[PDB]
Design a protein around this ligand. Structure first.
Ligand SMILES: CCCCCCCCCCCCCCCC(=O)OC[C@H](COP(=O)(O)OC[C@@H](O)CO)OC(=O)CCCCCCCCCCCCCCC
Ligand SMILES: CCCCCCCCCCCCCCCC(=O)OC[C@H](COP(=O)(O)OC[C@@H](O)CO)OC(=O)CCCCCCCCCCCCCCC
Ligand SMILES: CCCCCCCCCCCCCCCC(=O)OC[C@H](COP(=O)(O)OC[C@@H](O)CO)OC(=O)CCCCCCCCCCCCCCC
Ligand SMILES: CCCCCCCCCCCCCCCC(=O)OC[C@H](COP(=O)(O)OC[C@@H](O)CO)OC(=O)CCCCCCCCCCCCCCC
Ligand SMILES: CCCCCCCCCCCCCCCC(=O)OC[C@H](COP(=O)(O)OC[C@@H](O)CO)OC(=O)CCCCCCCCCCCCCCC
Ligand SMILES: CCCCCCCCCCCCCCCC(=O)OC[C@H](COP(=O)(O)OC[C@@H](O)CO)OC(=O)CCCCCCCCCCCCCCC
Ligand SMILES: CCCCCCCCCCCCCCCC(=O)OC[C@H](COP(=O)(O)OC[C@@H](O)CO)OC(=O)CCCCCCCCCCCCCCC
Ligand SMILES: CCCCCCCCCCCCCCCC(=O)OC[C@H](COP(=O)(O)OC[C@@H](O)CO)OC(=O)CCCCCCCCCCCCCCC
Ligand SMILES: CCCCCCCCCCCCCCCC(=O)OC[C@H](COP(=O)(O)OC[C@@H](O)CO)OC(=O)CCCCCCCCCCCCCCC
Ligand SMILES: CCCCCCCCCCCCCCCC(=O)OC[C@H](COP(=O)(O)OC[C@@H](O)CO)OC(=O)CCCCCCCCCCCCCCC
Ligand SMILES: CCCCCCCCCCCCCCCC(=O)OC[C@H](COP(=O)(O)OC[C@@H](O)CO)OC(=O)CCCCCCCCCCCCCCC
Ligand SMILES: CCCCCCCCCCCCCCCC(=O)OC[C@H](COP(=O)(O)OC[C@@H](O)CO)OC(=O)CCCCCCCCCCCCCCC
Ligand SMILES: CCCCCCCCCCCCCCCC(=O)OC[C@H](COP(=O)(O)OC[C@@H](O)CO)OC(=O)CCCCCCCCCCCCCCC
Lengths: 69, 69, 69, 69, 69, 69, 69, 69, 69, 69, 69, 69, 69, 69, 69, 69, 69, 69, 69, 69
């Protein structure tokens, strides 16, 4: 596909925000949720799942660009 | 069918936008939704479903052209 | 029935447009709707229903000609 | 009743047009409406209702001739 | 990614709060839960798991910044 | 009741279509739905229910003719 | 009441059509609807309700004649 | 009141037609409507309401004669 | 029943697609789901259930043709 | 069945991804889960079950192609 | 209250029908529903609730006459 | 207020009919509705609500006379 | 109550069908469900509950006739 | 009860299928489940329970016919 | 019972697979489990139980055919 | 058709105004409406529909010229 | 298209107001609605949707100018 | 954008009220809701979500001004 | 923010009521719920969670004033 | 906080009822539950936990007043 056009700016902003401030806020939210739910039931596996989700987010733009040319 | 006519330009724009900027924006929206809903309930299967939906979107024009000659 | 007459040209245009540019535009609209509604609730079954509707559209002229001789 | 008279030609034209070009145009309109309304809410039952209406149209002249002798 | 933008202040507040007062409150909650559940079943391994979770929290901002550029 | 009359052709077409192409299409739709919903939750009991519904469809004309003389 | 009069023929036609071709067409419509809605949600209870409605239709003329003398 | 007079014949005809052929035609219409609307939404309660309306019609002349002496 | 008619092409396409590309895609989806859910809870019985569902899909057209003549 | 058609590309991508990068990611996830759950309860049998699941995944395309012709 | 008047016949018919044929039909409907819903989830408590509802129906006329003098 | 006047007879008839034949017919209608809706969802609480409504109807004339002197 | 009237035929048909073909079909459905759910969790107590439900169905007409005179 | 009627064919098919191909498939499913669950926990008592369930299935039609006359 | 019908192919495949490749895979799984659990607690009696389970599997089709005629 | 004549100037002005200032004003009105209605119910699909309507407006002159020669 | 003409001032005012005071008022309205609806059901995803709508509004003039030349 | 104009005062009032008395009232409402819903189900995570929503509200004016220039 | 204005009195009342009579009533409700749910399952940890929620309520006004200036 | 106001009476009643009749009823319920569950599994530790919960209830008003000024 083409990254330009009438919606090029919106797509660019979303792609940079995926690894930018909103993405970091969401990742910090996952970290806070993992810490909070670990008070009663300590489970560090959810931390690993959160790290994997962060890795997926870091590669989200590449995946989208590969699937949608 | 025929890709030309009075509505040829609209169809062409929609077909290129399916894998273009609007399609990439929608895919980034799916990625953001997967990241956001994973804060409380971490579920990486929805990421796989989103990848499959992106693959379907990448093949949408081919499917439409095959069904509608 | 008879495909000719005073309204033969209108019927011919509609029959070719069912699988032509307007039909492809409508199918692309279904694909866009399926992609958009899958952001919050991923559901690939609606994609299958859309494919079935496209198959029905591809056979619409045959069905109409068979029912209305 | 009698199919002839001063209005025999009008009745003949209407009876042939029920399954002719105007009837096929109306059936194609139903198909287009079913396809269009299926973009947001996919519902293939309306296609079945449209097929039943087409079947009724194909038998309209017989029904009219049976009721009105 | 970029730490600035419209959501830079929110991200900064969350990053400092991860190791700040809310994070310390959550860690104290884990300590209280470990002490309380140890009344009937004494288990100091959960204290070690809580310490590991605190160590993860102390490194949460670094992990998020490394994954999300 | 009587199978003939002004609506005899419509009733005949519907009765043959119950076990004909439309009925087979609906049964294939049930099979596709059973296969699709079995991806996340494998449940072969719905296949048995679909087979029972197909058996009911195969006997639909007999049931209608018995109830409505 | 009296089954004869100026409207005796209309009443006779309606009474025979209740269990005749129109009634059978309506019952086949219920069967088709039950089959179609069972694709996504298999529910054979609606088939039982349809059978009960067919039984009511088969006794409709008797009920009307008993209530209206 | 008095059932005779200049309008005695009209009143007599209407009173006998309430439970006669027109009333039976209207009741058959209610039965047909109940059967038709039950194709998509099966609801046998409307059949009970129709039976109650038929019972009211059977007692309409008595009610009118009691209210209007 | 009859495999031909106005809906013969749709039925043929659905029957071949049951064991064709869409059916294989659905089966691959079941395999992916079995692999994904086996990360946390390894359960190879769901693989056997998926194989049985694939066997049912391979025999779906035969079952439909046997039930609906 | 046929591997080609409108959905041939999607099926091909899924079949190669079963043993490709997504399949390897899922297998690495199983390995990570086995390692993590072995910290408190060492169980190398789950490693054998994971190896068997990997073997099943390596043969998934063959199984699907054999069941669905 | 008074059981007679212009609506005495309607009230009498309804009171006898509560324990008459319509009431027995409704009770048989409850029995059929209890049997049908017990196929997947066997629950004989709903049978007890249905028996209690039948007991209430048998005493409905007495309750109405006691409340409404 | 005054119970007499030009509208004294109408008010008297309505007050006696509230607990008379029309009121009993309405109460029997509530009982029939409770029985009918209990076929699919058994709920005896609606019977209690119906009994309370009957009690309100039995006291309707007293309430009206107390509010409107 | 009275077994005759306008709804006597419907009540008779339902009473005979409770122990007739529909009742036997429902009982066979319970047997099939018990067999199917016993594949993963063998539980012969549900067979006893199904037998008790069949016994209740065999006595349903007697219970209805006793409660509703 | 009576084995004939509008639903006689459905009941006959279900009764023969209880000990026919579907019943044998379900029994083979129980055998496969017993074999699979015996890999980790060898328990041949579940095989005896499965044999008893097969014996119950072989006598299901007799039980249904005895309970429902 | 009858081994043929709409489900004859599925039953045949399951019966041959009981002693075929899936059955041999399950038996090899039992052997692997016996070997693995014998590392810490050597117990050759579980090998005898596994051999008995294999013997039961080899006779599963005969048992099913004898119980279900 | 011919773009010239007595009404050539009016047609030219309307055609340029479709994509000119009035068309842009109408499109801005759609954007304002989408923003305003999104305050209570956020729905970005209406933005996509508005973009499609803008695309239709951009091609309106071509469509009119193609249909009306 | 042309931004000038008789309606150039209106279009200019609307374009500047989209990102001006009215647009900021509408965005503040979305923020207030998100805060208010979060009192009973806390949902920060609606905040993300509101941010995306604000981003769309910021690019509305560019989209309109690109679609309408 | 421009903060001045005819709607500058309204925008200024809304921006100051977001962090002013109405915003504080809404935040106190969230605190009251969190306290009230914690009576039956104690959940302090909703307090964290409320704090995050308050942080978003404190940065709402900055976000709006950044998105809408 | 500013604590004064048109809504200053409402905000003041809510802030004092958070630690006033309504807040104490809610805290007593939490204590009553903890006591009541401890009858069957004694759990004093919920008392600690309730104390923490009370501490949060005591600091709610400070948190709101800090977040919303 | 302030113990007076519009809700002062409700708070006073709740505070006195915590150690009054409702609190004593709840404590007696805990004693009855401890006695009842001790029939099969004698456990006097639950009596100690109940005594501690009673001590907490006796100090509930003091705790609430200290936390909420
Ligand atoms: C101020 C202190 C720093 C924040 C500390 C805590 C942050 C919260 C995360 C952990 C709480 C976990 C326990 C929750 C307890 C819980 O049950 O939560 C339920 C609540 C609702 O989430 P869902 O809608 O997924 O849940 C549906 C049901 O679960 C409803 O209960 O979850 C959230 O709202 C938290 C996720 C937000 C995380 C993403 C936030 C970032 C996106 C927005 C960024 C701002 C956009 C601004 C645009 C203007
Ligand atoms: C420019 C970018 C490419 C377009 C991207 C998106 C296209 C829109 C489709 C997905 C949006 C889905 C979410 C919608 C959200 C939504 O609620 O939509 C509601 C809106 C109204 O649809 P209905 O009238 O079916 O809805 C009734 C109620 O639902 C009203 O809300 O749906 C549409 O207008 C979209 C369907 C148009 C699809 C067919 C268009 C092709 C036909 C016209 C071709 C041109 C004819 C020209 C003749 C001159
Ligand atoms: C006042 C005295 C000092 C506090 C002492 C005890 C503190 C509680 C911790 C130990 C209790 C353990 C036994 C619990 C017994 C138990 O079953 O708890 C269940 C309860 C609910 O937790 P989850 O939602 O994880 O549980 C789901 C199910 O388990 C429900 O039972 O757990 C908590 O609420 C405690 C965790 C809060 C810990 C994090 C608190 C800090 C985050 C909030 C900070 C304030 C944000 C303010 C924003 C305005
Ligand atoms: C040609 C193939 C054979 C037909 C196959 C399917 C037949 C349709 C039945 C199943 C579709 C179910 C899903 C529908 C999806 C759906 O939403 O339907 C909605 C549509 C409208 O029904 P209502 O007006 O009850 O609905 C009001 C709203 O629901 C509108 O949506 O229902 C029908 O038209 C079907 C019922 C007709 C059945 C009675 C037909 C027989 C009466 C006429 C006989 C001819 C008289 C001729 C006189 C000249
Ligand atoms: C690109 C990489 C290759 C794909 C890898 C993964 C594929 C996904 C399968 C495994 C995910 C399992 C965990 C899911 C996690 C999960 O919770 O999923 C939930 C989601 C929704 O499924 P249901 O509607 O059954 O679920 C209802 C609720 O469970 C909603 O959560 O499931 C799916 O969408 C996956 C099934 C699609 C499988 C069939 C797809 C093939 C049909 C469409 C073919 C295209 C038609 C095109 C027509 C134009
Ligand atoms: C960054 C470091 C490298 C990653 C290290 C760890 C990876 C996680 C695996 C081990 C954690 C085990 C303990 C978990 C603790 C746990 O309770 O997990 C629960 C969580 C939810 O899984 P389910 O939905 O199966 O669970 C349902 C309930 O168990 C919820 O608790 O499991 C996962 O999400 C992990 C499986 C993902 C494994 C497959 C990932 C690959 C598929 C996606 C590939 C990307 C697709 C991208 C498309 C855009
Ligand atoms: C003949 C057999 C004995 C009757 C058996 C059943 C009686 C019906 C009650 C139960 C049906 C419940 C399920 C209904 C299914 C249903 O959806 O009903 C809908 C229908 C319309 O009621 P509404 O107008 O309240 O409903 C508005 C919407 O719900 C329309 O669907 O309800 C009725 O007509 C029943 C209430 C009549 C009850 C009061 C009747 C007594 C007043 C009239 C007395 C005669 C006056 C004569 C003056 C000349
Ligand atoms: C063709 C082969 C012979 C049939 C073999 C299997 C028959 C099915 C029974 C066992 C399946 C159990 C596992 C199901 C898996 C399952 O989840 O089922 C769910 C499905 C829906 O049942 P409910 O509506 O009770 O369930 C609500 C939710 O559970 C939806 O999942 O259950 C049925 O449809 C089966 C009961 C029908 C049994 C009664 C049928 C006889 C009444 C109709 C007679 C015909 C009337 C014709 C009138 C025209
Ligand atoms: C292709 C190779 C031959 C097949 C080998 C294995 C067959 C599967 C049996 C053993 C697996 C045991 C471990 C399962 C692991 C497991 O957890 O299974 C769970 C899954 C769901 O069963 P339920 O719904 O009873 O379970 C509810 C929860 O347990 C969900 O996990 O069980 C089945 O689907 C297997 C039973 C099917 C057996 C009956 C099949 C025959 C009926 C259908 C016949 C076709 C009808 C066609 C109509 C068109
Ligand atoms: C690649 C190397 C060769 C494989 C070596 C080891 C194979 C595993 C057997 C021994 C492990 C024993 C210790 C396990 C440790 C353990 O705790 O296992 C637990 C795990 C789960 O089994 P269950 O669901 O019976 O257990 C329930 C709980 O025990 C969960 O822990 O057992 C299995 O998955 C192994 C049985 C599979 C054996 C049957 C496999 C053949 C059927 C599938 C054939 C493929 C179908 C394909 C269809 C597409
Ligand atoms: C003074 C304090 C600062 C204001 C605080 C709150 C502002 C309201 C926003 C949040 C309320 C959310 C809950 C509402 C509850 C609710 O149900 O609202 C319903 C109400 C009606 O909206 P719709 O017509 O979309 O709704 C149709 C149905 O939902 C009717 O209920 O929504 C609005 O009016 C709010 C949106 C206005 C937001 C845009 C305002 C800016 C445009 C006008 C600028 C002035 C133009 C002046 C020209 C002279
Ligand atoms: C008179 C004796 C003293 C009161 C003793 C008990 C007080 C109740 C608390 C413990 C019951 C726990 C077991 C409940 C069993 C239960 O299931 O409850 C369910 C019920 C509904 O609560 P939710 O809406 O959170 O629940 C949703 C679902 O759980 C519905 O079941 O909970 C409450 O209503 C209790 C919380 C009220 C506590 C706050 C009350 C103070 C706020 C109002 C102050 C007055 C405002 C006046 C303005 C005019
Ligand atoms: C008449 C004889 C004297 C009473 C003897 C026994 C009293 C019951 C206590 C011991 C039973 C223990 C075994 C239960 C077996 C059991 O499973 O119980 C379950 C049942 C439900 O409790 P939960 O809702 O905590 O349980 C949720 C699930 O466990 C449901 O099973 O527990 C209670 O209802 C007992 C607690 C009431 C105790 C508090 C009562 C005082 C509050 C109400 C005061 C009146 C307010 C009036 C306002 C108008």
């Amino acid at each position: 596909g083409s990254d330009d056009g009438a919606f090029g700016d919106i797509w660019a902003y979303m792609s940079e925000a995926l690894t930018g401030a909103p993405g970091k806020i969401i990742a910090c939210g996952m970290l806070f949720s993992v810490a909070y739910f670990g008070v009663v039931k300590p489970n560090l596996g959810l931390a690993l799942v959160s790290a994997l989700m962060m890795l997926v987010m870091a590669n989200g733009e590449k995946i989208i660009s590969s699937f949608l040319r």
